[PDB]
Write a protein that binds this DNA or RNA. Structure first.
Lengths: 669, 669
RNA sequence: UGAAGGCCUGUUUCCUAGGCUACAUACGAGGGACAUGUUCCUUAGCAGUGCGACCUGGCUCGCACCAACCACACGGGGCUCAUUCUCAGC
C-alpha cells in the first residue's frame, strides 16, 4: 500500500501497474518513481484534481496527453525522468500554462520540430538531457521569458550557431549546461544572442587547447560569471588561450581533470577579476614565478592532486616567489602531492592567506626545522593541516613565525620525540592542537607551558609515556575544555593530574588499563581522580579494565551529562556511588558483568535519565535483584534500545535466555 | 618442636641452643643441621644410646669428646660439617671403632700431628676438605685398610711425596680428590705407594701444559681409570703431554674448562683405551684429521661449547676426515658452537655413531640441501637434534641418507615452507618428528605420505595453514599415537580430519579458535570431530573459544581419561553430554562461565573421578542448581584443589562471594 | 683488637617459570551503506533504456572469537649486602 502522508502520497517501489486512485483528494504531491507503468490515462485524474506537482519518473511511459496537465491547471512541477517519450508535439503543451519546472531525462526525443514552448511563460527549470538531441534549437520565436536553467547533457550537439539559439532573446540563462556534448565549432555570435548568460558547464566536452582560444572570443562581451572546463584535453595553456575573457568579469573558473601538463608564462594575465580557481587533478610539472601573473584578486586556489607523481628524479617542484602575485589569496589547498619540501621563499607574498592545507603533500619532510615556515612570516595564518606527511621530528621553535595561528593539526604522522615545550615557541594564541595518531610522545613537566590558551587537545593513540610526573604537564592549560587520551594504555597516573582545569568539559579515557587506580586495595587508597572539575559534561571510561568504582569518586560532578563505563568488568556496585549525578542524561553500562541493578545505586541517576544502555549483562532474574528494575522499565520514558532482544537473564537455571521485561514481579514486594 | 618420625628425629632450623633429650629412645638417626650449638655434652647421650648416625653439622661446635662416640658404640655415620674444630687428637678416636663415614668439611684443623686413625678399621668415607691443610699425611702406620673415598678439597697442599702418602699401603682408594689445591710438584713415587688408586679429581688446581707432562709419568703403571683435569690452564697439548699415561688403562678423561686453544697432531696417540672424553667449554681453533689419532676405542665425545666464538673472519673450522679414527664412537655432542656449516666429508668414518646432537652449532645453515648429511651415509643414526640453528628451508630428499633414523628434531627454527612430502624421502622407519616452534608450515595433501611409521608428531606453535584440505594430511599416519596442534590459531577444519587414526592417544588443541565448529548453528551442523577413535586417552581443548559442546561429540570414547576444557566460555551444558566417560579420571573446567553444575550432565563422569578442578566459575548458590554438587562434595574422595578459596558464588544478591562448601542444602531436596 | 664463620633478620640486584592485566597488530566468521562484472525481470520478436532482486568482487566501517605482540600490576626462583645472637686463635 502507498504511504499516504499529509497530502504527499509517495508511492515508491510499489510495482504499481496502473495508476491507483485512492482516498486522499487534498493531495498536492504524488510520487510514481520506480514502478512499471504503461502510461498515464488522462482521465484517472478526476478524483485527483488538486495535485500541484507529480513525480512520475523511472516508468516506461509511452506518451503523454495534454489533458493530464490541462485538467490539472494548478501544476508547478512535472518530473518525467527516464520515461520513453520518443516524440513530442506542441499540442501536448498548448494547454499547459502553469508549469514552472519540466524534467525530461532519458526519453529518446532525439529530434524535435515545432514551437512546443510558446505557452510556458512561467517555466524556469527545463531539463532536456541525454535525449539524443542533434541541435539545440527548441523553437523559432522569442519565448521562455524567465528560464534560468537549460540543461542539455549527453546529447549529440556538434556545433553552436546563433540560428539555433535565437529563441532566447530576452531570457536570463542563469545556468546553461552543455556537458559531454562533443562540440567541434562555435559559430561567431553563438553566445551574443542570449539575453543574460551567467553560468556554463562544458564538462567532458573533449576540448582542445585550440578550440578553447576560439570559444573564449565567442564568450567575450558576455555576462558570464561561472565557467567550468572539467574533463577536457587541455594539455597546456598559453597567454593566448583565455585571451577572449579579457572583456569579461569572470568570477569562478574551473580546470580540474584536464591532464594539464604545462601552465605557460602569463597564462592567466587576462583574468584580473577571477575569485575562485580549481586546478585539481592535473599533472602540472612546475610553476615559474610568472605562472600566476595577473590574478590580483584571487581568493580561493585549490591544488589538490594538481602535481605530477614523483618520477627518475623528475619530481614536481615550485619555484620561489611563485605566489607573490596572489596578494589577496585566502584559502590555499595543496593536498595529495609529491613536492619534495618547502623552501625559504615558497609562500612569500601571500599577505592575506589564512587557511592553508598541506595534507599528504611532502615526501622529504621527515624533520621540521625552524626555517621551514619562514615564508609564512607575514601571512596571518589561522589554520595549518599537516596530516599524513610522515613528519618524524619537530625541531625547536619551528612555529615561531605563525603568530596568529589558531587551529593546528599534526595528526596521522610519525612524530617520535620527547616534547620539551619549545616546539610551541611563538604560538601566542593557539586554539586547539590536534595531535593524535603518532608513533611516540614522551611528555615532560613543561611540555605545554608555552601555550596557555589551548581549548582542545587531542592525544589519541600516541603511546603516551611519563604522564604521572608531577606536576601534571596539563597544569598551565587553564582554559582547556576538550581533552582526549584514548588508546594509550596508560598504566598509572597521580591524582595531581587534572588539578585546576576547572573548565574541562569533555574527557575521554577509552582503552587505558586504568584498573588498579580505583581498586580499594591500593598502596595508599583509590585515586580520587576527577577532583573538583565540576564543569565536566561528557565522561568516557569505556573499555578500561575497570573492576570497582570506589565510593565517591563522582562527588561534586553535578553538571555531568553522560557517563560511558561500558566494555569494562563491573559486578558489585557499592551504594550511593551515583549521588550527585542528579542531572545525568545518558548512561552506558553495556557488556559489563553486572548481575543486579538495585535502587540504592541507580536510583538518583535513573530519575531523569534520557537514554540507558545495559545490554549484554548477565542479569539475575530474582526478585531481590531486578524487581525494582523491571518495574522502572514498565513505568519509564527513557529510550532503551533493544530492550526485548539483548536484555536477558542468565540465572536462575530456568530463566536462561528469558526476555528481561517479562519477569513478573507482581507476586513479590 | 622437633619433627619425630619413625626413629629419625629431624631437628632442622629449630634455634636449638643445647641438645634436647625428648621421649623417643629407639631413634636411630638424628639431624642437627642449621642450629646454633655451643657444643655437644657427651653425657646427654645416655637417654639416647641407640642412634646409629647423627647429622651434627652447620653448628659452631668448639670441640668433641671421645665419650660421645664411645658411649654410642653402634655409630656408622658422624657428619661434622662446617663446625669449628681447630684441633683434633688421636684420643678423640682411640675408642671409636664402628664408624664407617666421617665427614669434616670446614673446621680449621689446619695442622695434624698424631696417629689419629689407628682405630678406624671400617671407615670408608673420609671427607677432609677446606681445612687449611698444608700436608696430606694423616698418620705414620699402614692404616685405613678399607678406605674408598679420601677428599682433600680447597686445602693448601703444595706438593705430593711418598712420605706423606705411605699410610695407605694396602688400601684401595676408589676416589682420591685433590681439587683446588695449588699443587706445584709431584715428587717421584707419590702415586706408586697407594695400593689401588682408581679415580682422581684435580679440578681447579691451576696446572699448565707443563706440570701435566710430569704428573703423567708420576701416574704411570698405576691402576687409575677416571681422571679429571677441569678448570686448569692447558692452553695447548702435544703428543708428549699425556705421554705418561701410555702404561695405563684409562677409561674416562675430562678436559673441560681448560681454555684449550690447540690440539697438536697426535696429542691422544697414547690412549688406545679411552672410552669417554669431555672437551666442553674450550676455545679450540681447528681440528686437523690427525688430531684424534689413537682413540680407536672412544665411545662418548662431547664438544659442547668446545670451539672459539665466531670472529674478524676467524671462525672455527673442522677439516674433512677429522673423525676417521673414531670408528667406535657412539655419542657425539656438538652444541653451542659457531662452525659455519657441514662439509661433504665432515662426519666421514663414524661407522658406529648412533646419537648425534647439533643444537645451536651452525651459523650459515639457513638452507639444508640434499648434500649436507652425505657424510652420515654409513652411520646408523638413531637421533638427530637440530634445534636453534636458524634453518629456514629444507630442500628435497635432504634426509635420504639417514635410513635408520628414529628420533628427529627440527624445533626452534625458522622453517618457512610448504611441505610436499619429499622432505622426508628416505626416512624408512622414523619414530617421532619434533617440529614445533617454527615460522610457517603450509600443509599439503601428501606432506606425510612417505613416512607412514610415525608415532609422535608435534606441530606446536608453527602457525599451521591448509589443515582443512581433503583428504586429511594425517591420513597415512596409521601408527600415530601422540599428536600436538596447540597454539596455531586453526580457524576451521573438516570432519574428515583424523579419520582412521585408531591408535591416537594424546591430542592437544590449546589456543586454536575452534568455537563455531561445535556451535549448533553451523552451515550443516556441528562437526562431529574426534570420530570413532576410541583409543584416545588424554584430550586437551584448553582456551579454544568454545561456547557449546553439542550432544554426542564424545560418543564411544570410553577410554578417555582426562578432559581439559578450561579457559573457555561454557554456560549451558545440554543433558547427556558426558555419557560414555565412565572411566574418566580427571576433569578440568576452570575459568569457564559455568553457573549450574547439575546431575544429568556431570553424573556419569563424577562417579569414579580422581581429581576435579572447576575454580573461578560464577557459581549460582541456589538449590535447584548446586544442591547435588555441594552434596557430592561432602560425600566424595575426589582430589579437589583449593575447594575453600577459589569456589565462590555470584548469585543470589546475598551469598555473593560466599565459600561454596558452607552452603547448607539441608532445607531442600 | 682485627681477621673467620654457622645463624637468622630485612633490603636490594638479577633472572626464570607463572597467573592477571590492557594495547597496538593479525587470521577468521557474521553484519549494515555502496556503484559496479553477469544473472533473472518486464517494459520500445529484437535492440536500447528505464519496478526492485540475487551471485560474485574491490571494500570502508562498527561486532564476536582466537593468536602471537609489547606494556602495565603482583606473586614466584637465584645471587649480592646489612647487625644482630655466639665461636675459636691470640
Amino acid at each position: 500500500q502507498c504511504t499516504v502522508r499529509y497530502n504527499v502520497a509517495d508511492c515508491s517501489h510499489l510495482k504499481l501497474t496502473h495508476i491507483p486512485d485512492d482516498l486522499p483528494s487534498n493531495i498536492t504531491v504524488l510520487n510514481l518513481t520506480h514502478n512499471q507503468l504503461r502510461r498515464l490515462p488522462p482521465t484517472n485524474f478526476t478524483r485527483y484534481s488538486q495535485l500541484a506537482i507529480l513525480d512520475a519518473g523511472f516508468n516506461s511511459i509511452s506518451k503523454l496527453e495534454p489533458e493530464l496537465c490541462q485538467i490539472l491547471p494548478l501544476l508547478k512541477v512535472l518530473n518525467l525522468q527516464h520515461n520513453e517519450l520518443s516524440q513530442i508535439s506542441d499540442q501536448t503543451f498548448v494547454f499547459c500554462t502553469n508549469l514552472t519546472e519540466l524534467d525530461l531525462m532519458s526519453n529518446s526525443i532525439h529530434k524535435i520540430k515545432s514551437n512546443p514552448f510558446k505557452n510556458q511563460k512561467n517555466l524556469i527549470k527545463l531539463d532536456l538531457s541525454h535525449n539524443g538531441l542533434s541541435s539545440t534549437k527548441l523553437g523559432t520565436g522569442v519565448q521562455l521569458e524567465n528560464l534560468q536553467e537549460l540543461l542539455l547533457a549527453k546529447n549529440k550537439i556538434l556545433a553552436l550557431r546563433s540560428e539555433e539559439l535565437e529563441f532566447l532573446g530576452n531570457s536570463s540563462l542563469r545556468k546553461l549546461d552543455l556537458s559531454s556534448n562533443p562540440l567541434k565549432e562555435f559559430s561567431p555570435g553563438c553566445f551574443q544572442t542570449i539575453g543574460k548568460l551567467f553560468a556554463l558547464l562544458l564538462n567532458n566536452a573533449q576540448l582542445n587547447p585550440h578550440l578553447t582560444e576560439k570559444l573564449c572570443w565567442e564568450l567575450s562581451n558576455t555576462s558570464i560569471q561561472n565557467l567550468s572546463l572539467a574533463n577536457n584535453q587541455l594539455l597546456a595553456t598559453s597567454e593566448s588561450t583565455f585571451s577572449g575573457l579579457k572583456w569579461t568579469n569572470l568570477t569562478q573558473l574551473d580546470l580540474s581533470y584536464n591532464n594539464l601538463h604545462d601552465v605557460g608564462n602569463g597564462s592567466f594575465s587576462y583574468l584580473p577579476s577571477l575569485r575562485y580557481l580549481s586546478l585539481e587533478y592535473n599533472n602540472i610539472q612546475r610553476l615559474s614565478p610568472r605562472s600566476f601573473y595577473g590574478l590580483s584578486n584571487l581568493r580561493y586556489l585549490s591544488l589538490k592532486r594538481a602535481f605530477t607523481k614523483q618520477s627518475l628524479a623528475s619530481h614536481p617542484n615550485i619555484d620561489d616567489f611563485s605566489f607573490q602575485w596572489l596578494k589577496y589569496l585566502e584559502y590555499l589547498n595543496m593536498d595529495d602531492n609529491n613536492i619534495p619540501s618547502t623552501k625559504s621563499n615558497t609562500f612569500t607574498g601571500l599577505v592575506s592567506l589564512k587557511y592553508l592545507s598541506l595534507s599528504k603533500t611532502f615526501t622529504s619532510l621527515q624533520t621540521l626545522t625552524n626555517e621551514t615556515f619562514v615564508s609564512l612570516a607575514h601571512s596571518p595564518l589561522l589554520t595549518l593541516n599537516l596530516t599524513k606527511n610522515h613528519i618524524s621530528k619537530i625541531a625547536n621553535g619551528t612555529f615561531s613565525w605563525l603568530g596568529q595561528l589558531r587551529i593546528l593539526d599534526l595528526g596521522l604522522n610519525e612524530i617520535e620525540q620527547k616534547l620539551s615545550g619549545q616546539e610551541w615557541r611563538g604560538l601566542r594564541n593557539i586554539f586547539e592542537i590536534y595531535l593524535s595518531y603518532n608513533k611516540y610522545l614522551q611528555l615532560s613537566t613543561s611540555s605545554f607551558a608555552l601555550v596557555p590558551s589551548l581549548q582542545r587537545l587531542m592525544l589519541r593513540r600516541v603511546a603516551l609515556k611519563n604522564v604521572d610526573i608531577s606536576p601534571s604537564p596539563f597544569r598551565p592549560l587553564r582554559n582547556l575544555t576538550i581533552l582526549d587520551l584514548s588508546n594509550n594504555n596508560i598504566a598509572n597516573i597521580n591524582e595531581d593530574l587534572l588539578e585546576g582545569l576547572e573548565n574541562l568539559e569533555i574527557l575521554d579515557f577509552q582503552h587505558n588499563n586504568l584498573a588498579r587506580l580505583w581498586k580499594r586495595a591500593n598502596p595508599g587508597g583509590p585515586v580520587n581522580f576527577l577532583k573538583g572539575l565540576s564543569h565536566l559534561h561528557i565522561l568516557n571510561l569505556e573499555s578500561n579494565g575497570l573492576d570497582e568504582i570506589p565510593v565517591g569518586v563522582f562527588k561534586n560532578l553535578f553538571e555531568l551529562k553522560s557517563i560511558n563505563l561500558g566494555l569494562n568488568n563491573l559486578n558489585k556496585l557499592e551504594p550511593f556511588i551515583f549521588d550527585d549525578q542528579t542531572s545525568l542524561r545518558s548512561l552506558n553500562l553495556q557488556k559489563n558483568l553486572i548481575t543486579s541493578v538495585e535502587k540504592d545505586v541507580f536510583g538518583p541517576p535513573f530519575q531523569n535519565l534520557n537514554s540507558l544502555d545495559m545490554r549484554f549483562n548477565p542479569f539475575d532474574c530474582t526478585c531481590e535483584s531486578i524487581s525494582w528494575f523491571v518495574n522502572w522499565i514498565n513505568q519509564t520514558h527513557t529510550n532503551i534500545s533493544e530492550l526485548s532482544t539483548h536484555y536477558l537473564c542468565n540465572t536462575p537455571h530456568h530463566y536462561y535466555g528469558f526476555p528481561l521485561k517479562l519477569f513478573d514481579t507482581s507476586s513479590c514486594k
